[PDB]
Amino acid sequence: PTAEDLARAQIPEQQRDQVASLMMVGVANYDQALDALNQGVGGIFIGSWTDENLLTEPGRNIEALREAVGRDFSVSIDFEGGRVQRATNILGDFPSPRVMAQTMTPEQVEDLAEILGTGLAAHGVTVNFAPVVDVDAWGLPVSFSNDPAVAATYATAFAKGLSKVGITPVFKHFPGHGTPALDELKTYDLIPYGQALSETDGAVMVGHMIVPGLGTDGVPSSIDPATYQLLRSGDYPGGVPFDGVIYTDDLSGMHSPAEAVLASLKAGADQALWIDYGSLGSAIDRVDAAVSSGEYPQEQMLASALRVQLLYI
Template identity: 55%
Template sequence: MRVEDSAGENVSNTVEGMKKFPVLALLVAVTVTTTLVGCTDNATDQAAPTSEITTTTAPTSTSSVAPTTTSTTPANPELRTKVAQLMMVGVRNFDDALAALEQGAGGIFIGSDTEAAILTTPGRDIAELHNRVGRPFAVSIDFEGGRVLRHPEVLGTFPSPRTMAKEKKPEEVRGMAYDMATSLARHGITVDFAPVVDIDGAGLEVVGDRAFSDDPAVAAEYASAFAQGMLDGGVMPVFKHFPGHGRASGDSHLGTVVTPPLNELQNFELVPYRSILATPGVGVMVGHMATPGLGDGKTPSSINPAAYQLLRSGSYEGGRPFDGPVFTDDLSGMKAISNQLTPQDAAATAIIAGADQALWLTTDALLPAIDTTMKRIAEGALSEQDVFAKAERVSHYQR
């Protein structure tokens, strides 16, 4: 995920008064024509094509969720509901979150741009979202410690992973992560996109003190302790960024990045994954780095089927299969993806490639993403059986 104040942090939202329908309106067929973009990692300044959407008149609201549209494919309400569960979107405030959840989103993301009132204001908080929506959903955040702490004024301040590893024993870090998790859970957050498992092997600023160590064995030990503390406190930890950003050619927030070849990752970046994935109840986030030797070697891992197959199969040296939930990194604010794909096309492509939940930092493209994924399913790119299996994995961390 993003570093505080990075290029990926400035996510635009639409103006007040956007239109929305309640959940039942998702079942009404309205024509939408979507222009799909090819999967590529070439990061340029050229804007990605947008979808052309035909909508009908709807009541106004204060959310930024786009007007309701439906796919040109035959209506399948149950399938569409499951597809919507595979979407996790960043929200601005309570109203934006409520609109997204009413339209079926499986989760919301609390970012630095989210109004803190959603964590603190009775009747306008996450507990009230549960009251109004009446179904389980996930609430996620980036809460690593150090420079990546969303809303520390509410949730607390904690040292960076590097400082944790230097100054504390693993069992002490487990206790600190427990304290972090209890604070998150008390405010309604259920998923933490942490700990970072990247190895600080190239001095990249985007990694730096977000990594526990430049030693894979040390990083694995402390990441495991952190993850267990999160679980102890009732929050699901998510290891990131598979297959490893530590020695990438640059910052994926800013453009295309390439890791060392896969055969080199196996003895460095992938070493922690040999052990940490044995922890039950954890998730994994797949990053946007291209890896030579992984698929075509050019496609970012988050939209590369070969990356998900590597994770699921554990077919790297000392690896183990992983059957837990898999997330994408941000698909809207990181240029390694956003320079090439709209959020809706990136979300559909990532889910088809192997992600269980596609993450991006605005509600704007929620319904187009559902439509695009439904269209790709109708075209045979993904089976309904696979969608239901993904939704089942997602359901285990929705509350």
């Protein structure tokens, strides 16, 4: 059968569970994770402060979660290099992107991601919110004169090593940094997504920056429909259309959380990421009601739910 037809068959039956699958919440421990997944959430996020026993404690780690929940779900982490977190004592860390491109070859970085990704996979991570593809992050510090082709080359290698061991890489943060106008992003920070999305299977995460000339004035990109339409169409130099899953950056570090979740989904996101402090049920209430009222059109919601289900096939 067709993979899409198989995923369509895995879309949840109840509408509350359909919209819940479009959300991904940061969790602090095993209990919070199980409570979120029992409400239908499509995935959980392991944050910098997340209890490390959730990775290592037998009977109360990710394998136990998959046991207690009889469905497929995503497990994300932010493992991009050069940043200590609770999970570092367990899983290690990449160097900072600047150190990797300064001192290693693209082949070493790809081989490094395969090895480190092996430890991530063995602990039940399925999504890594990395690599950064910001051009200046892979270059030397201090408008600038870094090379987008370098950022594209190393990000592509990094992502290929993760994919070899079954970890979905996610390029971030679309459409890039340096608030410079869209035209200036198209000749610089947008270039790496070209090679990134045409040579790997990675997903994309949209950031909160406000881009003059993209969509509506003063609106963060993560909740502006023009951002997602740009990603879908690929209408930028070197861009290729993208029909995979689009994540948001953490909507809590941006509105109320529930309104921000709905705002991002309505704009075109497939996975609304945020650090849940208990408001998950209120968000599901608000988003399910928007589908019933027509504020969130049903076919857009179901098209996103199909993209989410394709992750598990």
